[PDB]
Design brief:
mitochondrial, binds beryllium trifluoride ion, 528 residues, EC 3.6.4.9, binds adenosine-5'-diphosphate, 60 kDa heat shock protein, mitochondrial, chaperone, binds magnesium ion, part of a larger assembly, 3 chains, binds potassium ion, C7-symmetry, 20 helices, seven-stranded mixed beta sheet
């Protein structure tokens, strides 16, 4: 339907190389402890000052169609590396550019690009095997702090904050990051169960400070359906008054009749009672209701399974909470007097439901519920002066969290790009099946030095000399670019998650090797 | 999706410097007592003649994308300074331009911009600590008048007006500014409770002048619900007639039946009675109703809590007001015979609700209600001939109010920019961790002289010589630019709110240091 | 969002001065008795030939943004002068141009424009005080005729017409101006009460000429509600027939049943009765109904206050009118037999409601009702041949009316611009606080000669020489430009309202002084 432009041979390869080098030159200035930032113009408001590889990559589009194709492929590399590992986007970008450039000149009339790509994949598999062999697990929280600091552009405070959060909530807890209105970063831990549903009427407040409702050793009644009937809520009030204990009513909604009854009773006779809307809007609402039922110890009234009617409420059907506070925006429950066996079984059920399928939203909810049941969640308020600074620090903190999670899951290797450098001798033991596989192995061997050279170059020193000295040094000595000297990497804490390195290398090679097999390019003619 | 233009290194930095210099040159002519005004064309009507830094900054947009980026960053600086402190926008703008300019040449191949930024923040923290140490609190109203006069471009009348308003309403009262139709500024004080709800029917007027309804020692009946039934209003009239006292009915609305009853009775038997709509349209209506119930002393009929029906009204359920007037637009209640303990408890509840959360609208309503309860509010009618003069004087008056509030909250320091100048020796005691931190400290030290130099330059004298003489002077002697001589600031009343200075410096540094770390710029190609 | 063009220093000032000079040169040719007219093209129909300063000013817009800014400021001057005083728009325009031009060259590197503006305002205040001191009140109608003649471009007929109208309706009566279909101006006076509501059915006509309904000593029944029921109108007819007197039914509408009854009775038995719709469409309808009830003497049936039902009508509930005529378009009531005390009290109430607030419409209605009650209303039919001539004469007549009202309210001073000239010695007694205030005082002193110079220049003589001779003349001798010779102003009747002069000077100085403080001008780039 649309007329096309077709380009053959070396011209199209040169145009793709131009586009790829432009994108990777823009990205590569954000690599290493001495890397600089990139300012991307935002059409609506203030420009974004960022040091993230994938953010810079995704914001670059070129007018020329062939350079646009190269840019799109590099963007695919960066996006895959970001979505799989969460870090090492610039490393993947520079590796992709290096592989593409090295493979482009190796293409000749007699060369076989497909076999070159096969050899490249074979060499990458060997390098990944060596990386897995030479990695070591993470044991002490000091290594966690070191990994977080390295991934956060050498910020000690962020590393300490993340290490403290992981110590307090567990190495596989739920940690979230959001902007803070203050100057310095803050960490808060939410324990027990707390949901963003406040009290309905401003008449249950019985506190001097905070204008909240605080109860200790309180009854809890959970209703899956709404509360409107007089006889649907009176017997619970009778039980609470007879036992002389405060009562909480958590439901979808308390209707006007029951609201009037509760408010009138609390104002006249001083009956300690409060009402809270049920968190969640779908099946998650029912799951959370069952979760607080198990945690406090009781039953859900109005469930489709048993249909426990509210009229036949019993004193043993009400949960016991050690301390509950509810304010205008959210309510929390602490010290639920529930049996530990049922809580453990519910936790096992949640972890089992975490391992049946994925929907990009159900895993998050399951993790949230599990954290609320076991150890609570952690929230990081990222401080700053203006919006751009806060956004940049937030991106750095998210990168640090992703890298720390990867290091926990898989382990650590030498930082600074030396982990790939130590894998070069592993490539000397490979036997290519033919000349093209030899070419691919040589391409990967040459590419393995790219991250260290780029890191050294951003520091202002000659990358090749630093790489050569690293190779001629011991099996552990590496180069500290921030200090600018040859030091002990593991002692100085310059370490990287092995998952990030292997993922970046794998994705970059997988895309670049396929890219280097092109001979003919068809593009849409730029009519507009 | 949109093709981009990518610029590397010094060219993009030069373009940002051009944009920042243009915006800050436009803004900086509005600095000091001898600064001049800027005319901004308005698309709809008359142009705006303004001397406000943020107003000039936000109205400047540039065609070139990189100059636009620099302008947007400086606009962010000015906007943050305006929203946080309310004054010192031009100071923040000139500081931001100076920091960006000084940091741009310091960027080199071997320089580390991130460490330079870290050193800049360290130096700014030290300067802020010194500023906090050397500030002093505000004690006498004379200092309030001096601060208001300085912030209002040396206008004695505005300073005296603001000082009188704060004396008669309290240093933390509710003072608002609105345009006046006369030539000179006026100050009006509203005491007691007064809301913009006039009488419904023009038949309760019983005054010779003003065509209002005037009562003394009057009963007050407050109904949250509408008044329509005959039986819902008759017993209150019976109580009023038996006690032979005037009666006010404040409610959402008095319906036609009850209006007919009240009006016809008042016309026939001369029953002193008036009807007023309840102020507020949401929960604020209920809060205000409860507030006047506590102030006058009584109860709200029809509340959802107790549901005090109007049929069972008692003589002790009606509030007593010493003197109440109501006219076509608003009604005023004075001398409510309410118990002081309940009023104090309500005030405590208001101030507690002021300190739970923020919504940018609830704080204003809470402050309004608290002022109506305790001391009333003040309104400043800014006079003038045309609209442009009134707008300019209104901007100056708002700046004076913001500066006076900041001075009350935090304290005062030497004016004329010497407060930052005296902090230069504090920077000599800082030890940089490396060379880049030393560069950042030097940048901040050089930037600290910018406000005084700009103020002197706008006066027509050489800024550098004046700054040098100030540094070589005593620890207190400063330069009066309006008089143009070296004098005593604290004696002459040239003082500045320390909050304004510290906020402007902090925001300007925080944005400019981040800006000076750019190496690559991606902008949208100007297709249209 | 929109790219801006920013101009600094002398260039922007020069462009704004160019725009101001263009607009004021266009306006200033319409000044003095020998001034000429300006033709403004109307997009829809015939062009407007006008001699009004504000009409010429408001119709001028310039393509260049800076010249447009200057034109907008001069338009603000002219509009404020027109809306406040009603005359002296050209004087204000020329004063504004002179002040802006004089202040623009006084701006230098060392000058302080704000202090110059302060000195200008001080000098203007002194001049206004002198003008108020030297003015004299208006006592005789001859001065009224002189003022109207001077303000109407020296037209004796218009002055005599306005003087006669003010003699016959009072110096503060209601006089309106509307176009006439004849050649010469006419003055019509409406006495008593007359409203534009004619008889409904063409069956009550009982006159030989005019096809109206003429009655003497007639009963009047006023109903706020509609008349539809048979029993709602029969008893009034019984009373009228028993007393054998004509009857008028003034109501919102006489519906089909009652209208048919009235028509049938009047046609068969010759019952003298007529029906008229109530004037007004809102609360004004009720106010007018009450006013006719008070003037005639009676009550309004169906009012929401007392609800006087029409069934219980009494002979003392019907007003008595000496003569009532009603035609196809309007009805007139004369010689209402109402008690003078109630009429006086209603008049006092109307003047009191005139002094509570303003809504730009309610004052007009109150004045109309007061005039209808007390003395009547005057209407001026402005005659002419074509539409343009009628519009020009209408503009001149409105200017004369505004000037005469101002002279009545405040007083008169010497005309021809000598009133400002005599105020120059008052400026010699002012002591400036500094050099800039001295410059402002000199600017005002130089500007004070502009109106007389412009008036002389339009006459074809040298303005400077005429002004100089005026200054060296006596304290009363002035220059008649129309006669072109030096005479006695008060004897020759060349006088001006002091309010017009002071308002024009104040507004022009206030806007121009603010304009002369600009250093930077920011405009929107002309994209389209
Ligand atoms: N002080 C240091 N000395 C040497 N290498 C470092 C130092 N700090 C960080 N690095 C290395 O630099 C890399 C950080 O690059 P980064 O900007 O995170 O790019 P990416 O996000 O693509 O990993 C890490 O792989 C780390 O090994
Ligand atoms: N008479 C004076 N002599 C010396 N300095 C002054 C004088 N009046 C004001 N200043 C200084 O000038 C500054 C006023 O600048 P301003 O136009 O308010 O800019 P901003 O609104 O950004 O503070 C204040 O910081 C004050 O210290
Ligand atoms: N015969 C005359 N001799 C001298 N001055 C006159 C004469 N007639 C009018 N003037 C002066 O000319 C002015 C009239 O100008 P006009 O066209 O009304 O401009 P504006 O509408 O701005 O007042 C008046 O101020 C009056 O004093
Ligand atoms: F470039 Be990654 F996001 F650290
Ligand atoms: F520049 Be600020 F608003 F005084
Ligand atoms: F110019 Be004015 F309307 F006489
Ligand atoms: K990066
Ligand atoms: K300013
Ligand atoms: K004119
Ligand atoms: Mg990283
Ligand atoms: Mg200020
Ligand atoms: Mg005139």
């Amino acid at each position: 339907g649309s007329a096309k432009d077709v380009k053959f041979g070396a011209d199209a390869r040169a145009l793709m190389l131009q586009g790829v080098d432009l994108l990777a030159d823009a990205v590569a200035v954000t690599m290493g402890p001495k890397g600089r930032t990139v300012i991307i113009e935002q059409s609506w408001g203030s420009p974004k000052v960022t040091k993230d590889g994938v953010t810079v990559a995704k914001s670059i589009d070129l007018k020329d169609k062939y350079k646009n194709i190269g840019a799109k492929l590099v963007q695919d590399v960066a996006n895959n590396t970001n979505e799989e590992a969460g870090d090492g986007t610039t490393t993947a970008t520079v590796l992709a550019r290096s592989i593409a450039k090295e493979g482009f000149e190796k293409i000749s009339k007699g060369a076989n690009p497909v076999e070159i790509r096969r050899g490249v994949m074979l060499a990458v598999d060997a390098v990944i095997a060596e990386l897995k062999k030479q990695s070591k697990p993470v044991t002490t929280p000091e290594e966690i702090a070191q990994v977080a600091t390295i991934s956060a552009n050498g910020d000690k405070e962020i590393g300490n904050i993340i290490s403290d959060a992981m110590k307090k909530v567990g190495r596989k807890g739920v940690i979230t990051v959001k902007d803070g209105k203050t100057l310095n970063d803050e960490l808060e831990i939410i324990e027990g169960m707390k949901f963003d549903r406040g009290y309905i009427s401003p008449y249950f407040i019985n506190t001097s400070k905070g204008q909240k409702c605080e109860f200790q050793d309180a009854y809890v009644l959970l209703s899956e359906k709404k509360i409107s009937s007089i006889q649907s809520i009176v017997p619970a009030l009778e039980i609470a008054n007879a036992h002389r204990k405060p009562l909480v009513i958590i439901a979808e909604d308390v209707d006007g009749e029951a609201l009037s009854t509760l408010v009138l009773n609390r104002l006249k006779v001083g009956l300690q009672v409060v009402a809270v809307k049920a968190p969640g809007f779908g099946d998650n609402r029912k799951n959370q209701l069952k979760d607080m039922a198990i945690a406090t110890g009781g039953a859900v009234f109005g469930e489709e399974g048993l249909t426990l009617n509210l009229e036949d409420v019993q004193p043993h059907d009400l949960g016991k909470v050690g301390e509950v506070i509810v304010t205008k925006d959210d309510a929390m429950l602490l010290k639920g007097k529930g049996d530990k066996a049922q809580i453990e079984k519910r936790i096992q059920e949640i972890i089992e439901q975490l391992d049946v399928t994925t929907s990009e939203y159900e895993k998050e909810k399951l993790n949230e519920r599990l954290a609320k049941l076991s150890d609570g969640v952690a929230v990081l308020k990222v401080g700053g002066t203006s919006d751009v600074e806060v956004n940049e620090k937030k991106d750095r903190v998210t990168d640090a969290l992703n890298a720390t999670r990867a290091a926990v899951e898989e382990g650590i290797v030498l930082g600074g790009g030396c982990a790939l450098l130590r894998c070069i001798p592993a490539l000397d033991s490979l036997t290519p099946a033919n000349e093209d596989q030899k070419i691919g192995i040589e391409i990967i061997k040459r590419t393995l030095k790219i991250p260290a050279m780029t890191i050294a170059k951003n520091a202002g020193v000659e990358g090749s000399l630093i790489v050569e000295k690293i190779m001629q040094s011991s099996s552990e000595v590496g180069y500290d670019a921030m200090a600018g000297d040859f030091v002990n990497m593991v002692e100085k804490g310059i370490i990287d998650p092995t998952k990030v390195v292997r993922t970046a290398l794998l994705d970059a090679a997988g895309v670049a090797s396929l890219l280097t097999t092109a001979e003919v390019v068809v593009t849409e003619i730029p009519k507009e």
